[PDB]
Design a protein around this ligand. Structure first.
Ligand SMILES: *[C@H](O)[C@H](C[C@@H]1CCNC1=O)NC(=O)[C@H](CC(C)C)NC(=O)OC[C@@H]1C[C@H]1CCC
Lengths: 300, 297
C-alpha cells in the first residue's frame, strides 16, 4: 500500500495566481469566480494584526491582478466570505470541471496540488488529522493551493491552504473560507490540540491486511462501541462515530468480519502490543488510509 | 512527503486500446498510440508468444482505439521491441512537449495508473537496482506510463507490462525495451536480489534533519571506502564520488558533511533503529533522490 493521489489535471486547469501589491498567492478559477485566501490583501506588516474588513473597504476591483499563466483575467466584482476572497472575473473558465465544495471530517484523506505563482509543482495525498492540521509539504507562496477528491466526473474541493504552524504542520479552510480547527489567519503563534490516532483508518488498515491474507490478529471476541471508545481514548486513539462504523461497512462485508469484532481485535493489539509481529510488513499501525483508499488500491 | 508530478499533461494522452477480448491503455502522442504489444495475445498465446508471427496475422481493423467516446481509426501499425505503435488518422491536440528517456536505477518518476484509458491515480516510484518497481497496478493497468516533468517537457521513461509473483512490477521504456531481465510472457519470473539505493537513503536522512529530526546523527566519521564495505555487507548499493557530489547542496544546507551522514547511516545499519522512527517511518526510505529532497526543501 502506497499513498496514491487523484489525477490532478482537472484541478491544474483551474489554478491561477492572485496578486495585490507584491503579495502573490494562488487562486481557484471555477466558472467566472476566482477563490483565494483573503490575506492576499495584506502587506507583510499587516499580517501581524490584520483588520480584514478595513483592508478590503480600501480595495477596488482594479487593485487585484489575476493571471492564468501570464494572461490577465479582469476582475469585475469582489467579496469576502469568511477567510476567502471571491473575485468575479469577466471570463468563465472553459476548463471548469463538474465540481462541488465539501467540508471533510478529521481522518478523511484528500489530494493536494501544491502550487506556486499559479503553477502546479506536485501532487500528494494528505490526511486531515483529528486536531485539524495536515502534514503538508508547503513553502512560501503555496497559499491558495487546494485539496480535493474526485468521484466519477466530479471534483470535490475540500481544502484551501493558508498557514504553517510553529510545529511545522499546516492549516487552512474549506472553500467557503471556514478554517478547519481553532485557527485564525493572523501571523500569530498558534498551537494545535494534541493529536490522536485515526481509529477508523487503523481499522481500515486491519481490514486491508485481512483481505491480503494477513490475519493472525483476529480474535474470538467482540465489544460494544462504547466500551471500545472508552478504552481507545486511553491509548490516544480517536473514538469511533456512527459514520465511522458505516463507512467500514463495505470492508466488513468483503471480509465477513463485523466492525465490532475488528474493534475487539484492535483493542487486544492496543492492550498487548504486537509481540514482535508485523501486519502488512510493518510493526506500526497505519492511520492515513481511509476505508475508501483501501478499496481504491484493491479494486481500481 | 512523497510527491508526484502533476499528471494533467499525461492524462490528456491516455486512450483505450482493445484487440480481441484484451483491453489496456495506450499513450497517444501526435498521431501515434503506443501500447504494450501483449494486447494482441489471447489466453493461449501468452505462455510462449511469437510476437512477430502473431502481429503479421493482425490487420489495422483488429485494433479498437477509443479516446473517451470517440473511436480513432488505426491507419498503420508497427512493433518496436515490446511496444506496439498504432498510427491513427487524428493528431492529439493535447500532446505536450515530450521526450522518451531510459532512466537509471535509483532514479524516481511519477506513475499515472490508468484503467480502460481513464486515469485512476498518481504516485512516485523508483527504478529499483534489480530493475523492478514497487508499484500499485491491477488488471487492466498495462500501458500506464511513468514520467518526469522538467519545465513544460514530459520525459516518459516507463510503460507498464507485468507483475511478478512477489508483487513488484516490471515494464519497458518507450522504445519497448524492458528494464531488467524480464520477458513479456505469462510465466512466473523472479528478479535479481534487490539492494537499497544508498544515495537516496542519505538524501532522506538529510530531509529528516532539515525537518528538525536528528536523533540518529553521531560525532563519528568514516572514509568512503570503509562506508562502502559496510554498505555492501548489508546489500546497500555502493556510494560513488558523484553521489557524494550530488549530495553537496544538502550537506551545505545542513552543515553535515556527506561522510558524517555516512557514519550515521553505518550506525543505523549495524544497530537498527531501536524502536525509533525517522520522518514517521520504521524503515530507512530509499525512493527519494537528492533532487526530490531539494526540490521540496
Ligand atoms: C496488464 O494489464 C497486466 C498487468 C498486471 C496484472 C496484475 N497486476 C499487473 O501489474 N499484465 C499481465 O497480466 C502480464 C501479461 C504478460 C503476457 C506479460 N502477466 C502478468 O503480469 O502475470 C502476473 C503473475 C505473476 C505471473 C505468473 C505467470 C504464470
Amino acid at each position: 500500500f502506497r499513498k496514491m493521489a487523484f489525477p490532478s489535471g482537472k484541478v491544474e486547469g483551474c489554478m491561477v495566481q492572485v496578486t495585490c501589491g507584491t503579495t502573490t498567492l494562488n487562486g481557484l478559477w471555477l466558472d467566472d469566480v476566482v477563490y483565494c485566501p483573503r490575506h492576499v490583501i495584506c502587506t507583510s506588516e499587516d499580517m501581524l494584526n490584520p483588520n480584514y474588513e478595513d483592508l478590503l473597504i480600501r480595495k477596488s476591483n482594479h487593485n487585484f491582478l489575476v493571471q492564468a499563466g501570464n494572461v490577465q483575467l479582469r476582475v469585475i466584482g469582489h467579496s469576502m466570505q469568511n477567510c476567502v476572497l471571491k473575485l468575479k472575473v469577466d471570463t468563465a473558465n472553459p476548463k471548469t470541471p463538474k465540481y462541488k465544495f465539501v467540508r471533510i471530517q478529521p481522518g478523511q484523506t484528500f489530494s493536494v496540488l501544491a502550487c506556486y505563482n499559479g503553477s502546479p509543482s506536485g501532487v500528494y495525498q494528505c490526511a486531515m488529522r483529528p486536531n485539524f492540521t495536515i502534514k503538508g509539504s508547503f513553502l512560501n507562496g503555496s497559499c491558495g493551493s487546494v485539496g480535493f477528491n474526485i468521484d466519477y466526473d466530479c471534483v470535490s474541493f475540500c481544502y484551501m491552504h493558508h498557514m504553517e504552524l510553529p510545529t511545522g504542520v499546516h492549516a487552512g479552510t474549506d472553500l467557503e473560507g471556514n478554517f478547519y480547527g481553532p485557527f485564525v489567519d493572523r501571523q500569530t503563534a498558534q498551537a494545535a490540540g494534541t493529536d490522536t490516532t485515526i481509529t477508523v483508518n487503523v481499522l481500515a488498515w486491519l481490514y486491508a491486511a485481512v483481505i491480503n491474507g494477513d490475519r493472525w490478529f483476529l480474535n474470538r471476541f467482540t465489544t460494544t462501541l462504547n466500551d471500545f471508545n472508552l478504552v481507545a481514548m486511553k491509548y490516544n486513539y480517536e473514538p469511533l462515530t456512527q459514520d465511522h462504523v458505516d463507512i467500514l461497512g463495505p470492508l466488513s462485508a468483503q471480509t465477513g468480519i463485523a466492525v465490532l469484532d475488528m474493534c475487539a481485535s484492535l483493542k487486544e493489539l492496543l492492550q498487548n502490543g504486537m509481540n514482535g509481529r508485523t501486519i502488512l510488513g510493518s510493526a506500526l499501525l497505519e492511520d492515513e488510509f481511509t476505508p475508501f483508499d483501501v478499496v481504491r488500491q484493491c479494486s481500481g
